[PDB]
Design a protein around this nucleic acid. Structure first.
Length: 118
RNA sequence: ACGGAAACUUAAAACCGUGUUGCACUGCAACCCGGAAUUCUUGCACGUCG
C-alpha cells in the first residue's frame, strides 16, 4: 500500500477519554535517490571584492559543512510530528563527482573524505 | 451712328520611386508544512457428574 495509516491516541487526564489520531508515514525501507551540485562558486559581489573566485581551500571547508550538515541530519529529524520518533534517516553512498569543470585529480577524492565522516 | 462689334488665359502631366520601430536583457535572490495528545480504562475458560 506504499503508505501506512499509523494511528495514535489522545488521553486527557480530566476523564482519561480516548481521542484518536492518524499519522500516515512513509514505508521504513523507502529508499530515495539524493543529488546536489556544488560549483567553483565564483562571486557576484555586492561587496567591493570583485571577481573573488573561491579556491580549493575554501571549497574543502564546505565539505565539512556538507559533512556536519548531514551528520546531525542523520541524527535529527526530517519530517513533522515532532519529537515522537519519525524520520530517523541514514544517508548512504555519498559521493561527489566532477560533472563539469576543471577540478584536479587530487582534490575530489579528498572531498569525499568529509562525506564518509558522518 | 463709342477705335466700336465678336472672342475661355485654354489643352494635356500621379509629389511620386528606395526604407523592418530594429538590435544587447533569467521574473530572479532568501525561507522545514513545523510545533505539544497513551490505543486507551470494566472483564477469572468456566458452569455440569445417578
Amino acid at each position: 500500500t506504499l503508505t501506512e495509516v499509523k494511528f495514535e491516541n489522545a488521553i486527557n487526564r480530566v476523564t482519561a477519554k480516548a481521542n484518536p489520531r492518524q499519522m500516515e508515514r512513509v514505508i521504513p525501507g523507502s529508499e530515495f535517490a539524493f543529488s546536489l551540485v556544488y560549483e567553483v562558486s565564483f562571486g557576484t559581489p555586492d561587496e567591493e571584492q570583485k571577481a573573488s573566485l573561491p579556491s580549493s581551500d575554501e571549497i574543502i571547508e564546505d565539505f565539512n559543512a556538507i559533512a556536519r550538515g548531514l551528520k546531525l541530519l542523520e541524527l535529527d529529524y526530517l519530517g513533522g510530528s515532532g519529537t515522537r520518533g519519525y524520520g530517523q534517516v541514514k544517508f548512504s553512498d555519498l559521493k561527489a563527482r566532477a560533472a563539469v569543470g576543471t577540478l584536479d585529480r587530487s582534490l575530489l577524492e579528498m572531498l569525499n573524505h568529509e562525506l564518509a565522516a558522518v
